Every structure is written in structure tokens, then in C-alpha cells.
Symmetry: C2
Subunit: 301 residues, 2 copies
């Protein structure tokens, strides 16, 4: 039993983390085949980072200007390129430990593991969700840039997140591995606002279904409700509105537990209006929204 | 910024997880050098597990009776032995991916990462603490036995936990890697009681210090208190009593934040008596006790 935030086993991604330096900026890179992926502000000095013309900064630099450390420095930059806020450093040696991998732009609600990396070395691993303001609540210090987020499902590492920047909120913003930022964000030291952090209703529900499976059932109510009626209540508390696709993918969980989705939506409704009354569901006193339906199915079976 | 439950990078321990089978029992083993470590109930049939004479069951079995799968089956059991609830299967090949490692009996309060493993394959990684009833609140299914817990500090994997059994409570019990169970427990299907789960006061405090560093400061009070006076309040709420050694090891955190330990002990006291008032410290509505002082220092710097 039990239900904790799990991350994927990180070994496959560890053997891909390198140290990259351009001038005196050191950040982490992702080495896969003969290409070493990193955030593009590696080329920037401290004074440039207010509003920098990166392409103009990249002309200043050449192939030898970038130094990928790895364990010991034997990476020869054979080429360079700037794709949409990332640098791709073609190198001589192809990574012996390249796992089967793929680049994936995830969606809000979907979850991934983060391997936090300082100076090319992995420090820790935790599970994160991509929020609807397209930020993540992670744990990143200075030089966590270049750290990556992944799903290792079905033997294959799906890279979805590279970390770039913390925001004044204290939340973390970044990019897929083709460079483009999740959300409206940009890689400058300018004030940048995340929006409202709508809670991921379909995950709260899955985390509840997970709770019934682990033995917590006090939140189970004798009522039921409607999508439209639950959604009116979801709105006031700034929950994401529930779709039939959400009801679909909660299918197997409703099956396992013997509890219709809308019935769980009625427990959730009461749980939003009258609050949790000091009780704990699965060891939390708040409603947890960072386990997908898929996450719950996998950990409970 | 941010503060999430991190686990260590698991790669070093992944390359040590194997599949072990004796008769029709399949559980996970830990392969290190030419020895494959597993729980001793691998030898038991289903009917034996009520009260089994293991040593008598081990006479029935010989070197060929144990089949360590690994990726593909090429492990030749050259010897066998039963140390204090574990089997040690001397094999022909020494693990190419043996990390620097060590076996360590941890202490209550101390924390470790768990790599959950079903059929010799790692499934996920999460951080756990050894509770004072000597149980852990983990996430383990059927065939999680043989999964291990570790600290990877200073390049070296410190193995501390092998998983054996879930209890009727829903909590998890196991052993160090020399076999002996944490706590009073035994590897039989008999009813076995964990005691009171005293909360780890020195960790709640570190998790609070972590909160001041990340920007949450509402719980900061204008009062102070005494050890003896805080401890009287710790007792009613079944917190572990605070020592000067606890105050010592919180030193650097009191330094970083500019907040004396006892002052934090007075915030904690009010926080136990008047509760959290619906507010959240670091994203939790309860007091978190599974980050050590050491854990906090490492993640905040």
C-alpha cells in the first residue's frame, strides 16, 4: 500500500548530464548522441541578461568557445546552432550511455520527473506537474539551469522540460527540448507574471480514487452531482473545469473502486465548500493535484 | 527556490537490482560484487509463511535451487547462507556496475531514498524516513520485497533498508542489509503492532527553518520558550522530545535565518496549540517531519 510522490528511476537520465561553459557561465547540458543540449543564456554575461540580442551574441562566439565538461573534458564542439532558446552543440563522441529517448511537449496536468543538476552532476530527483499558468513548483537553486524533466515510460525516456529561470513568484519556468518555453515566458531578467494557478481537477479526483484504494474513505458522501453543477463549484474555487475526457480517463479508477466519477465529483464539491474539517486524506491536509490518473493507476497496481 | 521531497539519483542502485526466484516465489535482490542479497522468505511457499522454520526450510534447498535472473539469467549460485533474515547468494560474475557502497544501520529520524522494484526492475523512487516505531510510510505493492533504501552521500551508496512486509496498519517494515529488522518485527504472517508514531521534532523544526528560507514566515512569533517548556508541549501532541544535539545540528539553519532554535521552538509550540488556522507552510497544511536538518541544508544550498 501507501501513496507517495514517486519519480521515475533517474539512472538513464543521469548518464546524460554534462557541464557546459561559455566564458564564465557554467550550466548543465543534456548529451544525447553527438549533441549537447543546454539553455541559450549560456552565452550571456551578467550584464547582458537584461534584454540580450542572443543571435548577435552568438556571432561573437564560435565552436571552440563552448566547453562541455562531462566527467572529464573530451567533447569537441564540431558545430553549434540556436533553436528557439536552446543551443545544440554537435560534438565528436556520441554518448555511450544514450538511452532510447524522445523530445515531447507535454500538456497542463501531465506530470514528469525532474533531475536537479548543479555543475553537471545530478543532486536529486522529484516529481513535478506542468501547471496551467505553465510554471512548475520545483526545487531549483542557482545553476539548476539546464536540468531536465522526463517521463521514462515504456523503456523510453521522454524529455519534456529544460529548466531556465526562477520567477519573482518563486516558481520555475522553462522549455521543451526544442527550445520553446512553456507559457508566455522569455529568457530575460524582466518581471514576468504567471497567471492564476487553477487546480487540476482531474488529478484531485484521481488522488481521491487513490485514497479509497489505500483505505481513506471518510470523504465519501451519500450525494451525487452533475458535471455542470460540479463545474459551477469548481469555478468559484478556481479549479479547472471537468471534461468528459477527464471522466473517461478516470474510468479504470471508478472501476476498481466501484464509485462513479460524478459521485466522486460530489464528494469533491462538499470537500471544497465545507473543507476537510481537520482530517487528512492520504497524509495531506490539502487536496493534492499533482498525480495524474495514469500516475495513480501505475502506483496502485 | 522551492522545497520538495527529493530522492537521491537512483542510477547507481538501479544497476544492482536483480530478479530472484526460489521455487515459485519471485522477489527482488541486491547484487553487489559476487553476492546477491534478498529477503529470506524467498525460500517459503505460501502455506509456510504462517510460522516457518527457515533454517529447516533452507536444508531442503541447495545452490541450484536459487535462480537470480538479472537482465538475462547468467548468475551461477556458487554459495548460499542465511544472515539474520537475508539470503546471501555468492555468484560467479561480479557486478560490473557495482558502485562504491556500504551497509548502514540508520537511526530514527534519519532519512533515505527507496527504489521500488517489482520483478527486478526499478519502478520509481521516493524519499522515506525511519519512524520511531521503526516502520516506514512507503509505497509498496506485492513483490516489492527485496527493494532497498539508500543514501547516496559523498559518491558512496549507503544501503540501509531492505523491504520485507507490509503490516495490517498499512505501514512498511524491513531490515538493514545485515538482515536484522528495524524494530521488534519478524518475517511471519502474524499480527504485529507498530507503536505510537511520535513525530520527529527536530525535523519539523528544520522544515520550518526551510520555510523561512523559501519565504513563508507567518508562523514566526514574537515569543520564545525553553527546552523543558517546549518539551512539555511536545509530549501532549506525541512529539519526540528535543535534545541539545537537535539544537546543535539545527545550528547552521539558525545561522542562515537569524532565528534562535528555541524561538522556532516557540513558534512550533503555538503551532501545536492553536493549529495552522487554514494557512499553508511550504505547500502543506500539516507539519512535515520527514526532512532532516541535513536534508534542508543540502536542498537550500
Amino acid at each position: 500500500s501507501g501513496f507517495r510522490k514517486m519519480a521515475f528511476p533517474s539512472g538513464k537520465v543521469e548518464g546524460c548530464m554534462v557541464q557546459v561553459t561559455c566564458g564564465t557561465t557554467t550550466l548543465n547540458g543534456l548529451w544525447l548522441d553527438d549533441v549537447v543540449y543546454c539553455p541559450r543564456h549560456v552565452i550571456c554575461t551578467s550584464e547582458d541578461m537584461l534584454n540580450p540580442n542572443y543571435e548577435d551574441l552568438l556571432i561573437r562566439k564560435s565552436n571552440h568557445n563552448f566547453l562541455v565538461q562531462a566527467g572529464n573534458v573530451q567533447l569537441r564542439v564540431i558545430g553549434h546552432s540556436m533553436q528557439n532558446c536552446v543551443l545544440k552543440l554537435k560534438v565528436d563522441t556520441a554518448n555511450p550511455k544514450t538511452p532510447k529517448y524522445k523530445f515531447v511537449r507535454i500538456q497542463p496536468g501531465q506530470t514528469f520527473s525532474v533531475l536537479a543538476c548543479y555543475n553537471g552532476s545530478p543532486s536529486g530527483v522529484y516529481q513535478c506537474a506542468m501547471r496551467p499558468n505553465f510554471t512548475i513548483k520545483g526545487s531549483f537553486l542557482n545553476g539548476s539551469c539546464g536540468s531536465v524533466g522526463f517521463n521514462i515510460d515504456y523503456d523510453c525516456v521522454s524529455f519534456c522540460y529544460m529548466h531556465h529561470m526562477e520567477l519573482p513568484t518563486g516558481v520555475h519556468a522553462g522549455t521543451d527540448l526544442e527550445g520553446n518555453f512553456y507559457g508566455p515566458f522569455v529568457d530575460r531578467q524582466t518581471a514576468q507574471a504567471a497567471g492564476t494557478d487553477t487546480t487540476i481537477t482531474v488529478n484531485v479526483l484521481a488522488w481521491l480514487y487513490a485514497a479509497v484504494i489505500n483505505g481513506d474513505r471518510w470523504f465519501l458522501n451519500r450525494f451525487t452531482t452533475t458535471l455542470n453543477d460540479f463545474n459551477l463549484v469548481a469555478m468559484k474555487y478556481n479549479y479547472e473545469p471537468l471534461t468528459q475526457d477527464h471522466v473517461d480517463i478516470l474510468g479504470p479508477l471508478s472501476a476498481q473502486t466501484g464509485i462513479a466519477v460524478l459521485d466522486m465529483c460530489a464528494s469533491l464539491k462538499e470537500l471544497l465548500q465545507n473543507g476537510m474539517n481537520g482530517r487528512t486524506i492520504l497524509g495531506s491536509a490539502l487536496l493534492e493535484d499533482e498525480f495524474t490518473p495514469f500516475d495513480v493507476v501505475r502506483q496502485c497496481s
